[PDB]
Amino acid sequence: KLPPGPFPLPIIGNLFQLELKNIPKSFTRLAQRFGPVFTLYVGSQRMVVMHGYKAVKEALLDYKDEFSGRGDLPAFHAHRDRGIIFNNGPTWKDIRRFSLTTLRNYGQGNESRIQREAHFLLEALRKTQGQPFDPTFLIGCAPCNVIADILFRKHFDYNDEKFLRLMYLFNENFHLLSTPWLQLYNNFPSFLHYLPGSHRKVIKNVAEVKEYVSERVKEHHQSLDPNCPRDLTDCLLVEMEKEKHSAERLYTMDGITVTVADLFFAGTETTSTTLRYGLLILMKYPEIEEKLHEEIDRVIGPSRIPAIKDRQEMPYMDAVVHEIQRFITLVPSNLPHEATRDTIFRGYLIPKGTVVVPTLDSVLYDNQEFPDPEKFKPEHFLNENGKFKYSDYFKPFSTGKRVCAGEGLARMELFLLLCAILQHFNLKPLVDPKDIDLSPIHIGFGCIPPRYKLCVIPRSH
Numbered sequence: 001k002l003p004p005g006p007f008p009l010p011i012i013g014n015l016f017q018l019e020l021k022n023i024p025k026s027f028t029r030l031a032q033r034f035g036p037v038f039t040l041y042v043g044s045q046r047m048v049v050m051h052g053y054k055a056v057k058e059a060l061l062d063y064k065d066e067f068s069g070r071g072d073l074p075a076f077h078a079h080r081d082r083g084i085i086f087n088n089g090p091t092w093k094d095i096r097r098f099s100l101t102t103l104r105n106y107g108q109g110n111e112s113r114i115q116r117e118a119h120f121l122l123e124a125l126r127k128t129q130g131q132p133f134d135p136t137f138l139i140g141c142a143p144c145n146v147i148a149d150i151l152f153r154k155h156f157d158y159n160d161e162k163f164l165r166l167m168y169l170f171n172e173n174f175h176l177l178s179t180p181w182l183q184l185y186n187n188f189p190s191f192l193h194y195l196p197g198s199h200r201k202v203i204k205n206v207a208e209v210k211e212y213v214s215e216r217v218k219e220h221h222q223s224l225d226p227n228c229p230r231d232l233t234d235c236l237l238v239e240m241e242k243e244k245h246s247a248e249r250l251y252t253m254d255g256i257t258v259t260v261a262d263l264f265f266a267g268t269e270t271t272s273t274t275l276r277y278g279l280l281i282l283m284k285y286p287e288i289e290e291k292l293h294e295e296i297d298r299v300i301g302p303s304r305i306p307a308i309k310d311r312q313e314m315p316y317m318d319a320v321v322h323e324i325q326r327f328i329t330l331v332p333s334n335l336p337h338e339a340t341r342d343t344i345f346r347g348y349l350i351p352k353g354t355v356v357v358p359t360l361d362s363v364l365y366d367n368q369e370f371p372d373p374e375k376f377k378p379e380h381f382l383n384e385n386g387k388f389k390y391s392d393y394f395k396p397f398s399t400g401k402r403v404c405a406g407e408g409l410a411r412m413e414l415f416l417l418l419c420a421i422l423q424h425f426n427l428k429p430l431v432d433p434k435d436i437d438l439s440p441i442h443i444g445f446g447c448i449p450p451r452y453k454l455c456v457i458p459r460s461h
């Protein structure tokens, strides 16, 4: 039979068992009642939820081909079954694989690219002149430009209009997709798609991001030189000129825009948010910032640009960089998976096409691995001798068949960037540390941090 679960109602299914402002909290609640694997009908879509590390691991790692489907996500129909993030189609495996190699090869690697970005990041910060600013569209430019170098060999000035416009759309999409109305819509799309509302803005934003990618792509083709891949959208293009004679093609001008649109969005927004969350966290705990400042100076000093080698001798920072990703559970319910095959899991039948949800928050806040998981504590990642302590539970990028395609870059960005920033600036907040409320203001697709301002105070002059 199916995993156990509350008894669904006609039409709405299990919707009264779900707080829409906070699906993950409902999941945790249902997990107290029914254990680590359970069934939910939301609207008429059947859903199995895995909660806790044993169940989440097994699902992601033991059943790595039965659960490598991508659950549907209506707001993103313009990407469905193409690109990487949202194809559940035939076409995902190789587009993904190829995309992975290409990033590795552009990884003049990832450390220079990031390091060179840092120079413009630090400049923009200098330019705020210790006045109050909203960092959301200052610090975001940096992962935006890095992904944009790989993708288009393009580099944007920190206030070129289309630049700001792109980031803005990424940011609105991640925000909106974390709101109640978008959770309902994503599960009741036919009932709700032609009513007014928030879903339309997301759809219009998705389309707009595609148009801008689309053009960059037509432009790349119209001056393509197969001896010279200038970037990643080149390498995909080349891969399409190869197989033009074949009856089975898996590359489409539309497919390539999706692929790139995907990498652009994902490569910009999760990293931006995490950094922006970090700055708010470090500002709540001035003593943690302080320990950080003295460690940078000791190991790197006020001048020399940070570099990945510096990590293995910076155990506090490495602990902090991880604890920020653990504490915030940025994509708390993972992205949805679905069953490719009628599957048996702990003796339960999971019917093909069942959406499968390997919960990440429930792993990152394991009471056992991370005593006081609700509290931000770098020692969650320090052994009793002050050294870095790794955890099998550090899973904010998921794992297995659909693991983030960007994990390496992401992790490199968080450490070098958070290193740069702190090397040159003191963070300072416009309210007491005592008063910063770290709670996300929406929870769905993502965990979204409160809007805030800060000042950055130079350390070198």
Ligand code: HEM
Binding pocket: 070, 084, 085, 086, 096, 147, 262, 263, 266, 267, 268, 270, 271, 274, 330, 331, 334, 335, 336, 337, 396, 397, 398, 399, 401, 402, 403, 404, 405, 406, 407, 409, 410
């Ligand atoms: C802190 C930053 C990031 C976090 C927390 C994050 C997290 C995730 C998560 C949870 C998933 C879905 C996992 C699954 O389905 O099993 C994912 C998928 C993905 N990520 Fe990220 N990601 C981040 C940064 C990036 C970056 C920088 C890129 C681009 C270089 C990227 C590209 C993707 C893509 C294309 C997928 C789709 C996976 C697939 O279906 O094949 N992500 N990421």
